[PDB]
Amino acid sequence: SNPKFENIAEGLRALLARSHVERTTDEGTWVAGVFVYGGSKTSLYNLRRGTALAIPQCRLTPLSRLPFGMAPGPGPQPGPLRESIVCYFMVFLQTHIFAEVLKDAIKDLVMTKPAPTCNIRVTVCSFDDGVDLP
Amino acid sequence: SHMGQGGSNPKFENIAEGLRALLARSHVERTTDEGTWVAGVFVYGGSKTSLYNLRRGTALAIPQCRLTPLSRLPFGMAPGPGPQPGPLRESIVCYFMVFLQTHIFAEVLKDAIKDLVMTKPAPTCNIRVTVCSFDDGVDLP
Ligand SMILES: Cc1ccc2oc(=O)cc(O)c2c1
């Protein structure tokens, strides 16, 4: 009933089906993830919905906003709390090996789409002590 | 030290002062020439108000960092009910993330937050924190 989200999920599944790495552990801890940002608010939201369908084993934050980085020139730098218009979401995962596969799959999927979707960025991230999701 | 009207300061200002005191013990690099955002601390739990105060105090204490807004965590094992797929369901537990340019400073800040919140009453003392690492950095705008 949501063909847009399901079609993104299918694109992701086709890429993910080409690898067979473990997505869960007996420990069950949330120790890795992918950090997904840019594009546009709507395109990121749509990707998030498709990720949820394609990967039951993950957990997702809502969209939120990124702060600014460094400003060029002699100043002023932005305050740490200032919010940009660029959005992000986090995917929590139980294995780093699958985080790497998902990062590769997102990169491969979005590059086949027109802007702004192709401007979505992704990096693997790790959590030293895990995140105790409730 | 400075004292506001009536002999008290806001909680976020006292957090800033506490963080400044703890961080002053560690003379580690906070920035790099490359200027890339490769590390962070992920802060969660407590309550929305206690995280709000911690976030505001961290910003006041550390100009070299960048912070996300407060947001909400998904569930772990066995998510709560909802019409949407399990991975998307939101708990009532909140979080924010601090981005940093060095891994050592993320470690120092993680330890400072842990030490500071342990001195505060519940629910602030229930705040949790882990260092995180971004393999390719985050290209903040
Ligand atoms: C793979 C992907 C991700 C997000 C998207 O977001 C959109 O708005 C339209 C899409 O075709 C799309 C595709």
Numbering used by the authors:
A (entry chain B): 474 to 607
B (entry chain A): 467 to 607
Can you list sentences taken from the study reporting this PDB entry?
Critical for maintaining viral episomes are the homologous Epstein–Barr nuclear antigen 1 (EBNA1) and KSHV latency-associated nuclear antigen (LANA). EBNA1 and LANA bind to specific genetic elements on the viral episome, where they recruit cellular replication machinery to initiate DNA replication, regulate viral gene expression, and tether viral genomes to host chromosomes during mitotic segregation. The stable dimeric core of antiparallel β sheets is surrounded by three critical α-helices that mediate important contacts with the DNA.
We determined the high-resolution crystal structure of one fragment bound to EBNA1. We soaked the fragment AC37287 into preformed crystals of EBNA1 (468–607). The crystal of AC37287 diffracted to 1.3 Ångstroms and was solved by isomorphous replacement. This molecule binds in a region that is important for DNA binding. Superposition of the crystal structures of both EBNA1 bound to AC37287 and to DNA shows that AC37287 binds to a region that sterically clashes with the phosphate backbone of DNA. We identified a coumarin molecule, AC37287, that binds in this pocket of EBNA1 with the potential to inhibit DNA binding.
